[PDB]
Amino acid sequence: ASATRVIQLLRNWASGRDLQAKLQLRYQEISKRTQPPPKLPVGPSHKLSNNYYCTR
């Protein structure tokens, strides 16, 4: 976050933990909203032979 050093020390002392280690506001570390195309593999019953429906 965009916080001054003195305020950061004040918060860390008052809470008792290191806030900047684990912030609760999401930043650039999240994934992009645009993603490459997927492929989504087919299931196990997509065979061209030995796939009669009466057996499964």
Added chain:
Amino acid sequence: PADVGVFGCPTTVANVETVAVSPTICRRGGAWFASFGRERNSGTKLFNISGHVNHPCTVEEEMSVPLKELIEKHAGGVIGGWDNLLAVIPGGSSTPLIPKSVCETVLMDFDALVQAQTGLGTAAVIVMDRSTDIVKAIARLIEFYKHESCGQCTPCREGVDWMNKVMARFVKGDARPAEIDSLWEISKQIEGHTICALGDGAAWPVQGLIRHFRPELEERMQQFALQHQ
């Protein structure tokens, strides 16, 4: 037909050769006719020999004559020598083909050729040497069966058109290996489910070609995949 045949009357359908030989059997006795051939395969047979032979011909011969002897004696032998033989269909298009190894010591009668998973059929020997595309020949046979089906029952009609398309794609090698077994299944879904034996006679050549030359099909499709990347 023995109960309700032509015009609704009792009828019996007999081949030209059967009725043609019947009076000679009656005149000369049935035992003399039974003397030739093996048991349950008695008599003499007319053999047409065609394809890749020096002298294709029609010859009358005792029944259980070996295939190699029949080719070498009457037909003049396979063109380019016996080692040039690749495959042979002994009973017309309906019967499946057999390779050189099976036909080295095979006889011509119903029982022995059934044992070779072929059947005698009409005793129409068509030979092919190593210098022909056997896949192309079987595809042409399947196309002939596609053109010559009445089409009243769905198995023969639809499945034979499907097999014709699949075999035409196989000739170019455009398919994938997993399709080959699929084709086998298709044939098994045609044979035994049709009205007449044309469905069986169209399923059998595909089954025989697959069973005896699966490596050739796999090689051809691998080549097609390689050239087309």
